[PDB]
Symmetry: C2
Subunit: 274 residues, 2 copies
Amino acid sequence: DKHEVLLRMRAIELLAYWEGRLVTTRLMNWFGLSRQQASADIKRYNTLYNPDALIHDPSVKGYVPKASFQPVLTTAHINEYLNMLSGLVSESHALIAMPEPNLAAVQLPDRSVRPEVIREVLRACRNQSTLKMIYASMQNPQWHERIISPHTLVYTGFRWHVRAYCHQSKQFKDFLLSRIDRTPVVVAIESVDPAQDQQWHEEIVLTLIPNPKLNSSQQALVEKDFGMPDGRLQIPVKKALAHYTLQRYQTAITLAEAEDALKYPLVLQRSDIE
Amino acid sequence: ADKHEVLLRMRAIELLAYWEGRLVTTRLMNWFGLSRQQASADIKRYNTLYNPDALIHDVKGYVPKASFQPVLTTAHINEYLNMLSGLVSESHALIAMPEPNLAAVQLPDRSVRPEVIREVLRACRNQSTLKMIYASMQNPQWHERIISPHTLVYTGFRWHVRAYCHQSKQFKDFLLSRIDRTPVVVAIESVDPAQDQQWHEEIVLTLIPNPKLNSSQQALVEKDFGMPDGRLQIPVKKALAHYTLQRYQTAITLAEAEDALKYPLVLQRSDIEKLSSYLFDQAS
Ligand SMILES: [Cl-]
């Protein structure tokens, strides 16, 4: 089964698992299917993908998941349900998306990343090319020339950057896409092998724990909030993405942050701080 | 004429052209499982019915005309990432790699249970009243709450339901990770969500570069947030204002603001007064 069919199989699984009820009319409205094709899709799911996981409930005039029901196409993350609904309605321009009634999603609409920059940066990552561009940083906020060999575009959840060799500092660094003036241009200067970006290829395990300033009842709640399996979250990450992962989890890194236990219920275990 | 699946192929053509500057027929064929004949028919359709002569053959595929404008998508990079992320199954990963040269930092949620979503969502749709078991940082022992939920909210970090709390007679935010077992529908008359004043009242927050940064530094913050007058104006519901400020990593306190390079973006001092008390909007 190819993309079209699988996306419908995925929608059947998600409606049943997260809503607890699947009616053909929802599938019809989502995909513009006939009632016949929608019914046949539910049959294919209940026959080929998740055998007898769905039970017709004539009362609720719909299908419900059996108590045995486990997803087979999706992970059991609620992220899967939000991603399905968001793909049916694009509102990436909105501060607050409303993919369906009774659901609001807080977004960060990004206007600052130009297509002409992405086009060049992505081509240079694919070609392992070198770029000449105009940049500004907090350290050096006057526009200046930079020569970079990019390997990977990165979305942090807040900002876009490219991981690139800087030919002046001879270091692998993170370059903000919002801070590139005009169109980068390809130059015939030898690029550095991305396999030499140690921080990028080296993995570390971050251990996040409930804030020690919380009482033990409050700590049990933090374990629940983060679905911690054994009183911690262990997150394997590339060294060069570790800082961004911690900010994505809103983890306390600093002493004054960890002191505000209500604001920062999650801290990085000290050994890892080093 | 075009249903979801055809509209997805059209958007994909447009986003590859606009963001990558090149559309290779093999990319289409692999993404949607098309023959070269179906792939070329899709390009012909976008080029005929959607964006007349926007694409030209050249590379085993097509390039945007110099006058190329997107017709199906806003010029937000979010649309490109959304399209790519829809094609692969990576909602579980710390770091998604939706294509070989793009890494996305994600927050996979491990705490929201489907039996809770099933009951809360149905109750939102039905305007029902629920009894449930809840714990807060204030009262971290399990206790009963009686709620009339109206909206599920994802903040970018956590999931909550906006609901009327029948004991406190106040609309509050209940974290979905803090419900134990399955909520039960009860006979109590639900409360009209039209009475949630904080949900219905819109406000406008003003975000500025951190005044501790020098003039040159402040100009880059303006470039980062596409705000060339020096102010970013955020219209938002009062009950979502704190979540918006957090999603933007904005300083709201003096102590926060004092750290310029951690908080380059700050809330205007005169707007602090318009904000609710965060940890009074949270259920007990
Ligand atoms: Cl790529």
